Amino acid sequence: ISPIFQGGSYQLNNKSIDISSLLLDKLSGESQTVVMKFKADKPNSLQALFGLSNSKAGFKNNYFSIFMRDSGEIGVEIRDAQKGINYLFSRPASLWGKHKGQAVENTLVFVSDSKDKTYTMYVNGIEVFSETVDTFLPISNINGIDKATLGAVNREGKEHYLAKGSIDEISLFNKAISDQEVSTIPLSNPFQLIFQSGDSTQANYFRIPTLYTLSSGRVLSSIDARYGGTHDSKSKINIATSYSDDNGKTWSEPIFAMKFNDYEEQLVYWPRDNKLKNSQISGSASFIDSSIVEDKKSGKTILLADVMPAGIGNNNANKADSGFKEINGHYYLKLKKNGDNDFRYTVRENGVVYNETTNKPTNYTINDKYEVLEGGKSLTVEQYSVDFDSGSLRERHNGKQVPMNVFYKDSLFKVTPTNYIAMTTSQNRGESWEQFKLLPPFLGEKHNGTYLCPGQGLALKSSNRLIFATYTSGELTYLISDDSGQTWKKSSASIPFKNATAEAQMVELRDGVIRTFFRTTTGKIAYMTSRDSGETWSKVSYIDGIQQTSYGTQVSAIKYSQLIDGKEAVILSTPNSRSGRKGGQLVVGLVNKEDDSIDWKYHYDIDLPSYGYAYSAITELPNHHIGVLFEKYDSWSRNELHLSNVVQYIDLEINDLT
Ligand SMILES: Cc1cccc(CNCCS(=O)(=O)O)c1
């Protein structure tokens, strides 16, 4: 259908534009669609892009508006005082501001549908809200409407919510266009989605992106596929992967590298209201925090992730037990059988479940998949599904049986409720993944395991050494293998922090010289250096010129392959901010060969200082461009939980950065 109104090249410089004569007498019926292509690289704190209002005295709360905040939030108000209706819908972190230093044209599609009593907002190809009401209010049917306005809302004859930006195109339709029709509206996105709502994972949310370039040129990515909102475990979370064989231009339909089946994989819209947003899937096993490395010698790709048994996360992680028992200098996974008050069982060699009280083996064994078998026959449990239909979250048996896994809540045998580390491999560069194995304890029997640093592992260029960084209280604990990850050893490196979330990433500055950048509690990114390929580690220093928050955020890093201003180059990706997770930057450092110090010379703003930027992953693509996959929102803020499609991918070239 044609538009009833179509206009453009409107400059909003804190002066509203009156289009009432053009538009108001065209509006008819109760369903409308607004399509609007706009820029705002210097928004005011709070501004309206489009307004429909009763401007008369005493009717200040009769208007429709499409508004944004300088935090990147978008929303609408639909108010009529006489009808006693005051509707506000919005979603934080829905906008782009800048890309490569040019203002981004955001494509906004708002559908006001009177038949379905539903308001739907799309921005840059992403539905950010869809709200159904019991009492629909057509944006046209607001009492006494007499003004149509761009860049403000006219209330009692005055400009409210004055805007700074521009509207390249605006069109209105006296129809609620279909989801199908919306999909055909052309976009001007600076970004790409690799993982997204409705893909093969069926997770509505995603966190903790990774990126790694394989020697064949294939680019690999892993991520937390988060089902129960964006909450850290406890929840249901699988690890998913996707690859690109064309320098990041297109990406495979994702598959799982790590998954549990105790709970169904469900696409669920998690409540964002204050009473309910902290609802948590509370009985599901899960993974969290993946890290990737490629082993030159075997050609295998290796992926590690944290593992958590049902119910269990960071809060209630057994911080006094590794979950293994030492016997004769060997480690065995402890088990608790349904009905005991203690862990009276171990998984010895060949999965054989073994009674520790009697030292007699049982008729039960554990297969490669951590599944339970009795006399060689495989036991099952009934799966759970979740729903908010009763008003609050319910976790209910769903009728489907799945193999009994010792990480599950309904399992006859259960592991110790603490965090573990799992490892899987792919022989086909991420077209499929093996069953994972648990890594052994490194810090000992009574020490609960370390925490994987998400992102990349490090493959030393001049040898077969593989290193995965992990953290725990008071130290980083690097995991080192020289035999394609068959066996691992630890290299501990003390840090001056207790209970720090010390997510660390490494770059190889030259052959045998590793620098690790890590998150702290001080507001500065820290670093340490190894010169013997990770055997031993320097004292901690800190970077000046970049700010993080007191709680800090993960930082991603690569050694760039090409000299810049004639010097070795490292690239860092991080929020640059002491207030929140925003102001994303790539920072380019030039190495000083006389002392391996780094001059941080170029700062590249991914988008506005006020727009969200959290965890990230960077990689040098085979064409020497830079790929960035990142949380484009504040993943710390309690106001920005459970947003869909905010992990986004962009392509940069070095000259953009400098
Ligand atoms: C439950 C859990 C397991 C392993 C690691 C973590 C850390 N979560 C950090 C993410 S953030 O800084 O809170 O955004 C949590």
XYZ file of C-alpha atoms and ligand atoms in Angstrom:
673
model
C 0.000 0.000 0.000
C 1.094 3.548 -0.847
C 1.867 6.002 1.935
C -0.665 8.671 2.842
C 2.331 10.902 3.622
C 5.928 10.910 2.535
C 8.622 13.478 3.235
C 12.290 13.923 3.950
C 15.555 15.759 4.388
C 14.336 17.260 7.664
C 17.031 18.813 9.827
C 16.262 18.798 13.547
C 18.404 21.499 15.213
C 16.502 22.006 18.449
C 13.678 23.548 16.454
C 10.533 21.514 15.834
C 9.047 21.301 12.339
C 5.313 21.658 11.742
C 3.839 19.181 9.238
C 0.255 19.311 10.495
C -1.232 20.625 7.243
C 0.431 17.890 5.229
C -0.448 14.944 7.451
C -3.280 15.405 9.924
C -6.206 15.356 7.475
C -4.716 12.272 5.786
C -4.874 10.171 8.982
C -7.850 7.825 8.997
C -8.975 4.552 10.482
C -7.474 3.108 13.629
C -4.348 1.337 12.296
C -1.176 3.153 11.280
C 2.416 2.434 10.301
C 5.245 4.930 10.666
C 8.417 4.314 8.667
C 11.281 6.656 9.380
C 14.931 6.794 8.367
C 16.850 9.030 10.717
C 20.219 9.991 12.133
C 21.233 11.179 15.581
C 24.952 11.203 16.258
C 24.614 13.974 18.867
C 21.245 13.341 20.516
C 19.929 15.397 23.385
C 19.454 13.493 26.659
C 15.818 12.862 25.755
C 14.234 13.766 22.436
C 11.078 13.168 20.401
C 11.474 12.404 16.688
C 7.800 12.464 15.801
C 4.770 13.819 17.598
C 0.997 13.829 17.221
C -0.615 16.064 19.843
C -3.509 18.078 21.151
C -1.629 21.332 21.620
C -4.471 23.160 23.411
C -4.266 24.449 26.975
C -5.209 21.824 29.543
C -4.562 18.876 27.233
C -0.821 18.419 27.770
C -1.212 14.663 28.277
C -2.956 13.948 25.002
C -0.256 12.981 22.494
C 1.535 10.292 20.562
C 5.305 10.472 20.260
C 8.254 8.421 19.067
C 11.150 9.296 21.351
C 14.774 8.352 22.004
C 17.290 8.854 24.821
C 21.021 9.508 24.486
C 21.496 6.007 25.926
C 20.200 4.533 22.651
C 16.740 3.697 24.005
C 13.734 3.991 21.669
C 10.050 4.090 22.588
C 6.569 5.539 22.179
C 4.051 7.334 24.358
C 0.348 7.083 23.596
C -1.647 9.281 25.972
C -5.245 10.445 26.205
C -6.376 12.056 29.472
C -10.086 11.673 28.804
C -9.714 7.968 28.039
C -7.533 7.683 31.126
C -4.813 6.076 28.990
C -1.084 6.630 29.510
C 0.911 4.101 27.528
C 4.682 3.991 27.510
C 6.572 1.299 25.642
C 10.308 1.305 25.039
C 13.490 -0.718 24.879
C 16.986 0.395 25.868
C 19.934 -0.083 23.488
C 17.962 -0.096 20.218
C 19.907 2.465 18.168
C 23.116 3.168 16.268
C 24.735 6.602 16.350
C 28.013 6.459 14.408
C 30.042 3.971 12.373
C 33.488 4.773 10.956
C 32.846 8.352 12.052
C 29.693 8.831 9.980
C 26.188 9.174 11.373
C 24.191 5.945 10.982
C 20.822 6.047 9.217
C 18.482 4.150 11.556
C 15.436 2.556 9.959
C 12.430 2.693 12.240
C 9.145 0.914 11.616
C 6.328 1.369 14.108
C 3.101 -0.600 13.622
C -0.071 0.443 15.514
C -2.555 -2.347 14.874
C -6.164 -1.892 15.983
C -7.389 -5.396 15.197
C -4.763 -7.167 17.281
C -4.658 -4.333 19.818
C -0.884 -4.440 19.486
C 1.927 -1.878 19.219
C 5.117 -3.097 17.552
C 8.429 -1.266 17.127
C 11.216 -2.330 14.786
C 14.576 -0.650 14.556
C 17.250 -1.587 12.026
C 15.479 -4.856 11.207
C 15.033 -5.828 14.840
C 11.761 -6.002 16.702
C 12.536 -4.331 20.022
C 9.029 -4.468 21.448
C 5.593 -5.897 20.737
C 2.905 -4.940 23.250
C -0.724 -6.039 23.424
C -3.203 -4.024 25.488
C -6.751 -4.741 26.567
C -7.811 -1.179 25.688
C -6.360 -0.081 22.320
C -5.756 3.593 21.589
C -5.305 4.521 17.925
C -2.579 7.164 17.641
C -5.028 9.005 15.438
C -7.929 8.705 17.886
C -6.310 10.821 20.634
C -8.730 13.484 21.890
C -8.320 16.910 20.256
C -5.233 16.167 18.166
C -4.288 19.296 16.209
C -0.535 19.130 15.665
C 1.854 16.859 13.774
C 5.453 17.608 14.656
C 9.008 16.580 13.818
C 11.778 16.966 16.392
C 9.490 17.868 19.282
C 6.141 17.282 20.891
C 3.954 20.421 21.051
C 2.297 20.554 24.500
C 0.119 23.573 25.423
C 1.790 25.551 22.647
C 5.397 24.778 23.637
C 8.204 22.589 22.293
C 8.805 19.588 24.566
C 11.470 16.924 24.020
C 13.307 19.036 21.418
C 15.514 16.927 19.167
C 18.959 17.137 17.607
C 19.336 14.884 14.573
C 17.849 14.599 11.113
C 15.041 12.688 9.442
C 16.047 11.615 5.958
C 12.673 9.960 5.245
C 9.321 9.659 6.950
C 6.237 7.846 5.644
C 2.830 7.073 7.137
C 0.357 4.377 6.242
C -3.282 4.039 7.279
C -2.629 0.320 7.668
C -0.891 -2.000 10.098
C 1.567 -3.578 7.669
C 2.386 -7.279 8.089
C 5.547 -8.699 9.593
C 6.237 -9.947 6.058
C 5.899 -6.490 4.522
C 8.168 -5.010 7.201
C 10.911 -7.465 6.264
C 11.029 -6.036 2.749
C 11.772 -2.474 3.879
C 15.429 -1.821 2.927
C 17.894 -1.196 5.733
C 21.131 0.776 6.065
C 22.653 -1.259 8.867
C 26.301 -0.802 9.819
C 26.086 -4.241 11.449
C 25.345 -7.952 10.963
C 23.844 -10.590 13.225
C 25.618 -13.914 13.460
C 23.450 -15.394 16.187
C 19.884 -14.075 16.475
C 16.414 -14.709 17.918
C 14.690 -17.563 16.080
C 17.822 -19.188 14.699
C 18.670 -22.871 15.075
C 19.596 -22.364 18.762
C 16.115 -21.165 19.744
C 17.648 -18.995 22.471
C 16.036 -15.556 22.536
C 19.210 -14.090 24.063
C 22.990 -14.227 23.569
C 26.047 -13.227 25.568
C 29.821 -13.686 25.743
C 30.837 -13.615 22.030
C 34.088 -15.124 20.729
C 35.922 -14.900 17.393
C 38.879 -16.849 16.084
C 40.426 -17.042 12.603
C 41.402 -20.572 11.508
C 44.411 -21.271 9.290
C 42.174 -22.273 6.373
C 40.639 -18.785 6.396
C 37.389 -19.893 8.003
C 36.379 -17.566 10.828
C 34.813 -19.214 13.858
C 32.612 -17.821 16.581
C 31.129 -19.133 19.775
C 28.699 -17.613 22.172
C 26.472 -18.265 25.164
C 23.045 -19.168 23.820
C 21.001 -17.884 26.762
C 17.478 -19.176 27.237
C 16.325 -17.745 30.592
C 16.904 -14.106 29.795
C 20.461 -12.827 29.815
C 21.129 -14.022 33.399
C 24.408 -15.815 34.210
C 23.847 -19.371 35.477
C 21.627 -20.384 37.124
C 19.639 -20.560 33.885
C 19.698 -22.711 30.815
C 22.616 -21.876 28.536
C 24.138 -23.862 25.648
C 27.318 -23.025 23.756
C 26.628 -22.410 20.064
C 28.989 -21.855 17.126
C 28.863 -20.380 13.616
C 31.479 -19.855 10.908
C 32.183 -17.622 7.941
C 34.091 -18.769 4.881
C 34.000 -15.379 3.141
C 35.753 -12.943 5.518
C 32.741 -12.331 7.755
C 30.257 -11.504 5.006
C 27.969 -14.450 5.731
C 27.754 -16.984 8.536
C 26.539 -20.550 8.982
C 23.330 -21.522 10.719
C 24.572 -22.171 14.257
C 25.077 -25.581 15.841
C 25.822 -26.486 19.474
C 29.328 -27.224 20.640
C 27.981 -27.861 24.138
C 24.457 -28.682 25.263
C 22.313 -30.292 27.934
C 18.851 -31.782 27.370
C 17.347 -31.698 30.873
C 15.408 -28.573 29.855
C 13.848 -27.949 26.434
C 15.465 -25.289 24.222
C 12.689 -22.673 24.191
C 12.402 -19.274 22.547
C 11.003 -17.349 25.523
C 10.291 -13.666 25.985
C 11.625 -12.958 29.497
C 9.707 -10.362 31.587
C 11.455 -6.997 31.798
C 9.287 -5.549 34.554
C 10.823 -5.080 37.981
C 8.661 -7.617 39.778
C 9.639 -10.401 37.370
C 12.898 -9.668 35.500
C 14.971 -11.612 38.051
C 12.972 -14.760 37.418
C 15.538 -17.493 36.823
C 15.435 -20.943 35.294
C 16.456 -22.592 38.486
C 16.646 -26.318 37.828
C 18.686 -26.536 34.620
C 22.292 -27.589 34.056
C 24.259 -25.230 31.845
C 27.459 -24.030 30.259
C 28.847 -20.468 30.363
C 31.920 -18.680 28.962
C 33.440 -20.362 25.912
C 37.007 -19.931 24.628
C 38.503 -21.081 21.334
C 41.912 -22.111 20.027
C 43.267 -23.866 16.926
C 46.034 -26.480 17.227
C 48.436 -26.360 14.281
C 49.839 -29.868 14.652
C 46.620 -31.913 14.669
C 44.537 -29.293 12.893
C 41.836 -29.667 15.531
C 39.870 -26.708 16.854
C 39.528 -26.716 20.664
C 36.701 -25.183 22.666
C 36.444 -24.922 26.416
C 33.535 -23.675 28.524
C 32.549 -23.563 32.192
C 29.995 -26.228 33.172
C 27.398 -26.060 35.931
C 25.127 -28.826 37.242
C 21.398 -28.183 37.761
C 20.387 -25.345 40.062
C 23.966 -24.189 40.321
C 25.765 -20.949 39.419
C 28.342 -18.518 40.857
C 26.378 -17.813 44.072
C 25.821 -21.396 45.182
C 28.973 -22.888 43.627
C 30.590 -25.194 46.185
C 33.591 -22.996 46.996
C 35.381 -25.672 49.056
C 35.284 -28.753 46.819
C 36.775 -29.511 43.409
C 34.150 -32.210 42.931
C 36.904 -34.783 42.462
C 38.591 -37.120 44.929
C 42.335 -37.807 44.886
C 43.245 -41.489 45.089
C 46.841 -42.603 44.444
C 47.731 -39.299 42.812
C 44.754 -39.636 40.468
C 41.498 -37.715 40.166
C 38.008 -39.175 40.211
C 34.706 -37.331 39.744
C 32.618 -37.604 42.921
C 28.969 -38.663 42.745
C 25.989 -38.538 45.087
C 23.205 -41.110 44.715
C 19.550 -40.203 45.313
C 18.991 -40.558 49.055
C 22.467 -40.029 50.514
C 23.592 -37.041 52.576
C 27.144 -37.396 51.332
C 29.118 -38.225 48.203
C 29.748 -41.950 48.594
C 30.592 -42.702 44.969
C 33.287 -41.990 42.398
C 33.617 -42.475 38.662
C 36.732 -44.597 38.229
C 38.237 -45.868 35.001
C 35.838 -47.037 32.285
C 33.044 -44.957 33.836
C 32.559 -47.587 36.526
C 30.589 -46.126 39.406
C 32.321 -47.148 42.572
C 31.132 -47.262 46.165
C 33.632 -45.473 48.409
C 32.159 -46.915 51.597
C 32.638 -50.528 50.560
C 35.232 -50.073 47.810
C 33.021 -52.375 45.757
C 32.013 -51.274 42.242
C 28.331 -50.877 41.306
C 26.147 -52.065 38.460
C 26.059 -48.439 37.251
C 28.533 -46.833 34.858
C 28.986 -43.397 33.271
C 29.343 -43.144 29.486
C 31.381 -40.645 27.456
C 28.423 -38.281 27.504
C 28.229 -38.165 31.321
C 25.045 -40.195 30.986
C 24.047 -42.933 33.439
C 23.831 -46.604 32.473
C 22.732 -49.543 34.607
C 23.999 -52.911 33.413
C 24.793 -51.284 30.088
C 21.233 -49.982 29.759
C 20.731 -46.217 29.561
C 18.535 -44.503 32.152
C 16.324 -41.533 31.302
C 14.711 -38.536 32.978
C 11.705 -36.495 31.919
C 12.550 -33.091 30.407
C 11.391 -29.709 31.756
C 9.772 -26.784 29.932
C 9.330 -23.262 31.312
C 6.445 -20.795 31.040
C 5.050 -17.644 32.677
C 1.408 -18.548 31.916
C 0.411 -18.703 35.595
C 1.769 -15.218 36.153
C 5.181 -16.256 37.458
C 7.832 -18.678 36.138
C 7.064 -22.420 36.274
C 9.359 -25.338 35.536
C 7.244 -28.358 34.638
C 7.791 -31.882 33.351
C 6.884 -31.894 29.688
C 6.379 -35.580 28.896
C 9.568 -36.141 26.890
C 12.261 -38.518 28.155
C 15.978 -37.765 27.665
C 19.157 -39.586 28.711
C 19.981 -39.357 32.423
C 22.975 -37.044 32.887
C 24.868 -36.646 36.163
C 24.677 -32.834 35.809
C 20.845 -33.018 35.937
C 18.397 -32.394 38.779
C 16.426 -35.630 38.203
C 19.570 -37.805 37.898
C 20.029 -40.821 40.202
C 23.708 -39.850 40.425
C 24.741 -36.191 40.790
C 28.047 -34.389 40.596
C 29.215 -31.968 43.275
C 27.363 -28.635 42.939
C 30.266 -26.476 41.784
C 31.822 -25.062 38.611
C 33.826 -27.322 36.302
C 35.692 -26.810 33.030
C 34.752 -28.770 29.874
C 36.615 -29.207 26.604
C 35.266 -30.287 23.213
C 36.982 -30.572 19.812
C 36.071 -30.284 16.141
C 37.922 -32.122 13.365
C 35.968 -30.308 10.617
C 36.550 -26.695 11.698
C 33.266 -26.336 13.514
C 30.953 -28.280 11.251
C 30.509 -30.642 14.237
C 31.791 -31.008 17.790
C 32.758 -34.018 19.942
C 31.265 -34.863 23.320
C 33.022 -32.791 25.955
C 35.286 -34.082 28.696
C 35.837 -32.520 32.097
C 39.309 -31.109 32.745
C 40.945 -32.352 35.986
C 41.422 -30.102 39.049
C 44.609 -28.011 38.898
C 44.659 -26.237 42.233
C 43.803 -29.393 44.142
C 41.228 -31.595 45.829
C 39.729 -29.066 48.232
C 39.950 -26.128 45.817
C 36.866 -25.507 43.705
C 37.894 -25.057 40.084
C 39.031 -21.952 38.228
C 36.929 -19.815 35.873
C 37.534 -19.807 32.133
C 38.468 -16.520 30.552
C 36.084 -16.269 27.610
C 37.335 -15.351 24.160
C 40.429 -16.971 22.696
C 43.105 -19.368 23.836
C 46.599 -18.770 22.504
C 48.457 -20.891 19.989
C 52.120 -19.913 20.202
C 53.358 -19.331 16.658
C 56.774 -20.964 16.940
C 55.645 -24.190 18.639
C 52.816 -26.579 19.547
C 52.001 -24.893 22.874
C 48.311 -24.207 23.609
C 47.346 -21.876 26.484
C 43.910 -21.160 27.971
C 43.715 -18.428 30.599
C 41.539 -18.952 33.660
C 41.037 -17.015 36.876
C 40.342 -17.644 40.530
C 40.878 -15.710 43.761
C 44.341 -14.161 43.994
C 45.731 -15.438 40.681
C 45.387 -16.127 37.005
C 45.784 -19.800 36.264
C 46.955 -20.462 32.729
C 46.195 -23.902 31.300
C 49.037 -25.239 29.165
C 49.122 -28.167 26.744
C 51.921 -29.168 24.397
C 50.158 -32.266 23.068
C 47.037 -31.016 21.267
C 45.112 -30.643 24.528
C 45.299 -34.291 25.595
C 47.024 -33.257 28.813
C 47.120 -29.912 30.562
C 49.316 -28.326 33.204
C 48.819 -25.126 35.203
C 51.024 -22.070 35.446
C 49.869 -19.857 38.313
C 50.415 -16.089 38.245
C 49.487 -14.126 41.382
C 47.448 -10.926 41.147
C 46.763 -8.342 43.880
C 43.022 -9.036 44.131
C 40.778 -11.344 46.087
C 37.474 -12.331 44.431
C 38.109 -10.438 41.179
C 36.389 -11.396 37.939
C 39.752 -11.373 36.203
C 38.847 -12.181 32.603
C 42.170 -12.246 30.786
C 43.207 -12.332 27.134
C 46.673 -12.894 25.697
C 48.666 -11.579 22.760
C 52.012 -12.909 21.537
C 54.201 -9.786 21.211
C 56.961 -11.841 19.590
C 58.136 -15.449 19.619
C 57.884 -16.670 23.217
C 56.696 -13.295 24.591
C 53.105 -13.298 25.854
C 51.225 -10.322 27.193
C 47.979 -10.801 29.030
C 45.435 -7.997 29.445
C 42.880 -8.506 32.168
C 39.870 -7.043 33.939
C 40.310 -5.791 37.520
C 38.481 -3.996 40.319
C 40.560 -0.798 40.124
C 39.087 0.946 37.080
C 42.178 0.222 34.975
C 42.889 -2.686 32.660
C 45.893 -4.589 34.020
C 48.594 -6.615 32.345
C 51.428 -9.053 32.900
C 54.107 -10.497 30.602
C 55.734 -13.895 30.074
C 59.022 -14.387 28.218
C 59.342 -18.135 28.509
C 56.146 -18.999 26.611
C 53.978 -18.906 29.749
C 56.114 -20.876 32.217
C 56.556 -17.792 34.375
C 54.813 -14.453 34.697
C 55.795 -10.878 35.518
C 54.291 -8.647 38.182
C 51.083 -6.727 37.394
C 51.028 -3.279 35.805
C 48.083 -1.224 34.579
C 47.167 0.711 31.440
C 46.672 4.480 31.608
C 44.381 6.228 29.132
C 41.553 3.708 29.199
C 38.884 3.750 31.882
C 36.667 0.917 33.087
C 34.153 0.722 35.900
C 34.952 -0.464 39.424
C 33.455 -3.858 38.544
C 35.159 -3.869 35.137
C 34.379 -5.579 31.804
C 36.051 -8.273 29.686
C 38.693 -6.975 27.254
C 39.569 -8.642 23.912
C 43.000 -8.462 22.260
C 44.990 -9.452 19.189
C 48.471 -9.029 17.836
C 47.942 -7.388 14.425
C 49.868 -9.082 11.600
C 50.916 -5.868 9.855
C 53.264 -3.126 11.023
C 51.632 0.215 11.788
C 53.718 3.393 11.646
C 56.528 0.863 11.231
C 55.999 -0.811 14.611
C 54.490 -4.054 15.990
C 50.810 -3.533 16.694
C 48.364 -4.884 19.276
C 44.626 -4.113 19.201
C 42.477 -3.879 22.380
C 38.651 -3.922 22.505
C 36.867 -2.545 25.563
C 34.377 -0.062 26.933
C 36.156 3.233 27.653
C 34.186 4.580 30.612
C 34.163 4.935 34.408
C 30.315 5.146 34.629
C 29.007 2.131 32.742
C 29.500 -0.384 29.956
C 29.492 2.091 27.084
C 31.821 4.062 24.833
C 33.241 1.096 22.982
C 36.719 1.408 21.642
C 39.362 -0.351 19.675
C 42.690 0.968 20.952
C 45.776 0.445 18.793
C 49.106 0.063 20.563
C 52.588 0.338 19.079
C 55.230 -1.845 20.760
C 58.517 -0.248 21.803
C 61.058 -2.917 20.911
C 63.613 -1.604 23.418
C 61.439 -2.520 26.398
C 58.203 -4.083 25.074
C 56.204 -1.201 26.493
C 53.143 -0.175 24.499
C 52.213 3.307 23.300
C 48.421 3.484 22.992
C 48.314 5.816 19.997
C 44.918 5.424 18.307
C 41.497 5.275 19.959
C 38.603 4.219 17.711
C 35.067 4.881 18.974
C 32.828 1.999 17.889
C 29.785 4.248 18.416
C 28.808 7.168 20.702
C 30.386 7.453 24.177
C 26.867 7.066 25.575
C 25.875 3.972 23.554
C 26.302 0.543 25.111
C 29.392 -1.605 24.667
C 30.159 -4.605 26.819
C 31.874 -7.959 26.276
C 33.636 -8.331 22.946
C 35.660 -10.386 20.478
C 38.047 -9.143 17.794
C 39.922 -11.048 15.149
C 42.165 -10.275 12.202
C 40.209 -11.585 9.204
C 42.272 -13.223 6.435
C 42.032 -10.059 4.331
C 43.574 -8.077 7.233
C 40.311 -6.380 8.093
C 39.214 -6.500 11.728
C 36.096 -8.348 12.797
C 34.262 -7.289 15.954
C 31.452 -9.250 17.594
C 30.204 -7.538 20.710
C 27.452 -6.890 23.204
C 26.010 -3.578 21.978
C 24.375 -2.697 25.295
C 25.075 -2.441 28.987
C 25.170 -6.049 30.172
C 25.808 -4.900 33.731
C 22.861 -2.496 34.017
C 19.734 -3.819 35.729
C 17.713 -1.724 33.270
C 18.986 -3.557 30.193
C 18.422 -7.234 30.927
C 16.798 -9.541 28.398
C 17.260 -7.522 25.189
C 17.199 -9.494 21.925
C 19.707 -9.158 19.082
C 22.213 -6.846 20.774
C 25.257 -9.037 20.150
C 26.337 -7.575 16.816
C 29.102 -7.964 14.242
C 30.980 -5.263 12.346
C 33.800 -5.110 9.827
C 36.639 -2.597 10.123
C 39.838 -1.849 8.222
C 42.936 -0.471 9.927
C 42.690 2.935 8.319
C 39.263 3.332 9.911
C 40.920 2.812 13.286
C 43.661 5.359 12.622
C 27.639 -18.087 37.076
C 28.991 -17.673 36.504
C 29.924 -18.684 36.069
C 31.154 -18.316 35.534
C 31.501 -16.927 35.422
C 30.613 -15.962 35.849
C 30.951 -14.504 35.729
N 29.935 -13.699 35.159
C 30.490 -12.412 34.672
C 29.615 -11.624 33.720
S 29.217 -9.935 34.177
O 30.482 -9.150 34.496
O 28.357 -10.006 35.362
O 28.493 -9.263 33.033
C 29.317 -16.349 36.401
